[PDB]
């Protein structure tokens, strides 16, 4: 089913976007953890990283190739921590696949 | 130069310190952690030597993606049924302790928010 990600592809609701191209979109995070937390999403409805087909390996790899991009022009140039959550005890909030990227602070350890 | 480097995870991926294994391809090599954060947390890291996410190659998107793909495979091969949180550290603000690209997955155990 839809979801909010879905209305933000759409552009039917507003959100900070920093990069769009075919395949994706990268939008600051509503509810931020971190002086930077943005999200990294495909524009395909992939609903949770545990039904990806082996396919979307390339897709995957473009949402982390993306966020590293614009960690850098960013400015997180001492580093960040890039998470995807699955299911109820990963914490996944929205059942759309999203590539979380966090810094501007020290992250720590465990992750959660 | 020996294929992998000289990092923990290049030695592991060579068979010269020891590791429990969970799967093995051309590509990655998943294992589990050595210091756990959760009750299953382990590791998927390429074969070919890259040292943090932030000096990967365009070409490298298929790569990356493969770790995500091997992670959910082996999470579901374990048994985690109820989820997981997949993790890449980069640089001192990350967190990141080795050099060597490495997906960490961790569950069997209620994940909280922030993630660090
Ligand atoms: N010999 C080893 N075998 C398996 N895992 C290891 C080993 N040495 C370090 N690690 C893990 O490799 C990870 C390094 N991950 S971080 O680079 O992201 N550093 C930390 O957050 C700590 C850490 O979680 C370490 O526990």
């Known amino acids: 089913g839809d979801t909010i990600f879905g209305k933000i ?3 039917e609701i507003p959100a900070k976007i920093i990069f ?3 395949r994706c979109l990268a939008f600051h ?3 931020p953890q971190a002086p930077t937390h943005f999200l990294v999403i495909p524009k395909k409805h992939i609903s ?3 039904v990806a087909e082996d396919d979307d390996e390339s897709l995957l790899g473009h949402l982390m190739i993306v966020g590293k991009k614009c960690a850098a022009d960013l400015g997180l140039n ?3 921590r890039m998470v995807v959550n699955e299911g109820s ?3 996944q909030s929205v059942y759309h696949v999203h590539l979380h990227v966090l810094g501007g602070r ?3 350890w465990p992750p959660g």
């Open 9 to 11: 592809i759409r552009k």
């Open 20 to 22: 769009e191209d075919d």
């Open 29 to 31: 995070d509503i509810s």
């Open 48 to 50: 949770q990283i545990s």
């Open 78 to 80: 001492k580093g960040y």
């Open 89 to 91: 005890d990963g914490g």
């Open 106 to 108: 020290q992250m720590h």
